[PDB]
Amino acid sequence: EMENVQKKLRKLERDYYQIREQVVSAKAGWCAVMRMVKDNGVERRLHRRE
Amino acid sequence: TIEERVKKIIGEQLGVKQEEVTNNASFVEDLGADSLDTVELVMALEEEFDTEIPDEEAEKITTVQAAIDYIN
Amino acid sequence: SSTHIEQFMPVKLAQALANSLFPELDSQLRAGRHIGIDDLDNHAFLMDFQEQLEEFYARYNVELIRAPEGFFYLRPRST
Amino acid sequence: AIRVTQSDRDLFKHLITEATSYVSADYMRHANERRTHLDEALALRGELFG
């Protein structure tokens, strides 16, 4: 059962790697907008949590 | 090199200047990276050097000097 | 139908140009005078037919402009 | 006086409201996609470690 479960673990590992790469790539792009919206445009006006 | 690849990751994951990121520059107060920003920073540090870090030992890292210390 | 003002001009624009205030105002405007809130007659007139006047003067390659403070004036284009 | 000011106000308000509606919506869309993928990555991370 543990060997069979180590196979599910490995599937999860590969999935996790893929998701990791995708998340980092998203952040890299979003950084530019953050530096660009330092004009005090973001604090409340743009970031409407509602 | 590792000691400048760390800067490569930190500057482009927090968007702060290369000059700002010194060895002792803490992420939260100096670089301004908050909870999710620091999470993404540690994830990027993991990806750059294709390694993995424990949860507690990773969260212990809260500075450029500490970042390199765990990296190197 | 034919021989009908609408064929050549909007009714409101013709109505404005036929007003007794227009020649005075036109003359002045062309000379560069600014129009504020105190000269009621003129100001009110301007307000009533703003868009028609703007459209009209456009023919000349000049903008009839309204500053935020409520005063009208003429700004010529390069052409 | 009224006739002036009322106009001015109408234009101000309309531009403001429509522009914020136009921009904030997509800004939040992006933020939410990034949040979602990060959350999935953290769940995968924790489950893998355990």
UniProtKB/Swiss-Prot annotation, chain B:
Residues 1-72 form the Carrier domain. PROSITE patterns: CARRIER (PS50075), PHOSPHOPANTETHEINE (PS00012). The keyword Nuclease does not apply. Pathway: Lipid metabolism; fatty acid biosynthesis. Keywords: Cytoplasm, Fatty acid biosynthesis, Fatty acid metabolism, Lipid biosynthesis, Lipid metabolism, Phosphopantetheine, Phosphoprotein. GO terms for biological process: fatty acid biosynthetic process; lipid A biosynthetic process; lipid biosynthetic process; response to xenobiotic stimulus. It comes from the Bacteria. It is found in: Cytoplasm. GO terms for cellular component: cytoplasm; cytosol; membrane. GO terms for molecular function: acyl binding; acyl carrier activity; lipid binding; phosphopantetheine binding. The modification O-(pantetheine 4'-phosphoryl)serine is found at residue 35. The keyword Phosphoprotein applies. 4'-phosphopantetheine is transferred from CoA to a specific serine of apo-ACP by AcpS. This modification is essential for activity because fatty acids are bound in thioester linkage to the sulfhydryl of the prosthetic group. NCBIfam families: acyl_carrier, PRK00982.1-2, PRK00982.1-3, PRK00982.1-4, PRK00982.1-5. Carrier of the growing fatty acid chain in fatty acid biosynthesis. Belongs to the acyl carrier protein (ACP) family. PANTHER family: ACYL CARRIER PROTEIN, CARRIER DOMAIN-CONTAINING PROTEIN. Interacts with MukB. This is Acyl carrier protein. The gene is acpP.
